[PDB]
Design a binder for this molecule. Structure first.
Ligand code: N81
Ligand code: NI
Ligand code: ZN
Length: 350
């Protein structure tokens, strides 16, 4: 029944009306009822009515505390990205560096051309990424799809323990320029993410279906054996870049999509994704959960080498939503197997 919908696990695009846009968890349950999650990634275009902020002229003086210079080493479609932290700078400062002739977007015809240039010049002229900036660009009273307060069950983490994990249950802002990259990864604890591109040049995405995620890992282990030996989940370091031709070459299924200013992307539990920014832009993101995520959370394979320290205690979730399995789970005898094609239970309404 669920296998029926989006059997090609292709990236789907949604155009919710305002009535649908109002309830966040509801619409997530909906797009999953349509099989959107099978691609690991979905685009959601909000109603033209809606805007999260009246004007982005207010922000040239906002500080980016920890700009990141992205050095990329590799060849033949395989790369490792090293971060070099630069001194703080303002949005105005960043935009100036971004739009400069040294760092700006090259001229091109079709998207495929910008993409080939990206994979050709990835290792040259290392760009700067205004990344992991704590903050939101939502106006205080915007009640729809507010990344600052989506009100999903991920809230049980702060609610129960007071713990906040930056960018995960709090928002992050990402200022990009041409050729700035995000490496292949799933979210921490294999959560969902929501990504809103406030303004600027597009952000292009690659994605691998969760049902084929393990195959991408096998490949990654094979190409980076030293990293594989030192960490059980080295892709969580977010340093590993792998071109579409390489995936194609080794039969890893994947899809592409380009995100325009004013568009949302949703990534789904155990959805590997990666991509790059086209030029100067600004994106806001955080993680979130649904009931379906819980099993992913329980089974998430985490970074063992301490480079990624994000760890959420699953105990509250299993107690509250899997009471019949708590004893079993707590005693390590819970061998539930995950079906990546099933939608979250909240979609029973649909
Ligand atoms: O850019 C990154 O380093 C992570 C990325 C982002 O937040 O832009 C993430 O893929 C996501 O959107 O969930
Ligand atoms: Ni991500
Ligand atoms: Zn690690």
């Amino acid at each position: 029944e669920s296998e029926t919908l989006n059997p090609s696990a292709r990236i789907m695009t949604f155009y919710p009306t305002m009535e649908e846009f109002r309830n966040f968890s509801r619409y997530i349950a909906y797009i999953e009822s349509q099989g959107a999650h099978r691609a690991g990634l979905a685009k959601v275009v909000p109603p033209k009515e809606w805007k999260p902020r009246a004007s982005y002229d207010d922000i040239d003086d906002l500080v980016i505390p920890a700009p990141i210079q992205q050095l990329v080493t590799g060849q033949s479609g395989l790369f490792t990205q090293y971060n070099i932290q630069k001194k703080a700078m303002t949005v105005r400062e960043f935009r100036k560096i971004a739009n400069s002739d040294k760092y700006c977007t090259p001229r091109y015809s079709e998207f495929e051309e910008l993409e080939r240039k990206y994979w050709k010049n990835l290792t040259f002229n290392p760009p700067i990424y205004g990344a992991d900036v704590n903050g939101t660009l939502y106006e205080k009273h915007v009640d729809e799809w507010n990344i600052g307060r989506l009100r999903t069950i991920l809230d049980l983490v702060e609610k129960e323990s007071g713990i906040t994990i930056e960018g995960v249950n709090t928002p992050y802002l990402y200022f990009g320029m041409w050729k700035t990259s995000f490496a292949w990864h799933t979210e921490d604890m294999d959560l969902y993410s929501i990504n809103y591109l406030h303004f600027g040049e597009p952000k292009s995405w690659y994605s691998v279906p969760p049902e084929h995620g393990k195959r991408l890992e096998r490949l990654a282990k094979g190409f980076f054996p030293g990293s594989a030996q030192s960490c059980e989940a080295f892709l969580r370091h977010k340093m590993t870049l792998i071109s579409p031709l390489m995936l194609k070459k080794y039969g890893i299924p994947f899809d592409k999509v380009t995100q325009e200013a004013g568009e949302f992307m949703i990534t789904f539990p155990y959805g590997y994704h990666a991509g790059f920014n086209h030029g100067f832009n600004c994106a806001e993101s955080t993680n979130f959960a649904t009931r379906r995520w819980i099993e992913y959370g329980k089974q998430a394979v985490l970074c063992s080498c301490r480079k990624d320290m994000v760890k959420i205690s699953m105990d509250v979730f299993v107690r509250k939503f899997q009471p019949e399995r708590y004893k079993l789970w707590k005693a390590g005898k819970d061998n539930t197997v995950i079906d990546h094609t099933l939608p979250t239970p909240e979609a029973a309404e649909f």
